[PDB]
Design a protein around this ligand. Structure first.
Ligand SMILES: [Zn+2]
Ligand SMILES: [Zn+2]
Length: 298
């Protein structure tokens, strides 16, 4: 029997959505299949929604609750920016300063009100934007980070978040991957069951540029890039690119604020961080969509 693969879209601090989705998944999938499933969270665990702390607590609990599952946590653009603020991102491998990432978007500083508190000088651009005070709806910053700060019991933009975030949560953020590659997954197609490679990345991959070169920077967590299109892109990362569009590679993302299935391209973000939208997961091989708003039984 083929291994069950669960890909879960953007959570954005909605603990009730996460919990209810996890509960529904256990009625959609028989216990034997669920117990040994590969579970890929597609990123964006923080911001917009009210309970980031509880979300990360829940995600930390999963290896203990389900010891035979494999858990993969993608970094979303929101989580990258959160990690940046906490100073958890490695210094750029090319020897450049984290402050060098600011220049490209320097004109945006005033309107976005970039963070200038403790440790800002050695902070990635996205960290400063994330903890910024956007000029006046946005929750504190352009990233809606206000709700993340508040879930850890501190005011928006406060350097005290660095003390308030538990060591286990910092460890969780450090353990996030920018890309996940799986050699062999099963997926139902119109022609039947196929074995495919899987690439999971928060937003997607870029056209034109060499795919392996892109994967290299994601594997290595290249922090010299001001805005990582693989985490933050839109139209430029929507399609499966040139080298991978040969029906042997599943490319799964969240990020886009849409649930969109087009053959091997799986975009799983029905929620978009909206309080009134469901969080969806896709279950492979069947490609069935499970939502927190489902009322499933076995
Ligand atoms: Zn998102
Ligand atoms: Zn995103």
């Amino acid at each position: 029997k083929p291994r069950t693969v669960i890909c879960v879209g953007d959570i954005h601090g909605y603990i009730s959505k996460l919990n209810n989705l996890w509960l529904n998944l256990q009625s959609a999938i028989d216990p034997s299949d669920f117990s040994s499933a590969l579970v890929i969270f597609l990123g964006d665990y923080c911001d917009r929604g009210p309970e980031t702390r509880k979300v990360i607590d829940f995600l930390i609990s999963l290896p203990e609750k389900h010891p035979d599952q494999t858990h993969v946590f993608l970094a979303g653009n929101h989580d990258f920016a959160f990690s940046g603020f906490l100073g958890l991102l490695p210094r750029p491998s090319d020897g450049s300063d984290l402050k060098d990432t600011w220049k490209e978007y320097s004109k945006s500083e005033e309107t976005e009100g970039w963070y200038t508190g403790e440790g800002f000088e050695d902070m990635h651009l996205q960290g400063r934007r994330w903890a910024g005070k956007i000029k006046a709806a946005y929750k504190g910053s352009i990233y809606d980070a206000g709700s993340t700060f508040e879930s850890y019991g501190v005011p928006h933009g406060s350097s005290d978040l660095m003390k308030a975030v538990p060591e286990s949560h910092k460890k969780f953020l450090t353990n996030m991957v920018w890309v996940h590659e799986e050699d062999d997954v099963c997926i139902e197609t119109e022609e039947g069951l196929k074995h495919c490679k899987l690439i999971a990345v928060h937003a997607g991959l870029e056209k034109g540029n060499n795919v392996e070169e892109q994967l290299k920077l994601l594997r290595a967590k290249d922090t010299s890039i001001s805005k990582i299109q693989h985490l933050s892109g839109r139209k430029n990362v929507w399609d499966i690119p040139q080298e991978l569009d040969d029906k042997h590679t599943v490319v799964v993302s969240g990020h886009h604020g849409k649930l969109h299935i087009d053959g091997m391209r799986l975009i799983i973000d029905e929620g978009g961080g909206f309080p009134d939208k469901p969080v969806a997961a896709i279950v492979l091989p069947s490609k069935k969509i499970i939502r927190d708003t489902d009322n499933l039984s076995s």
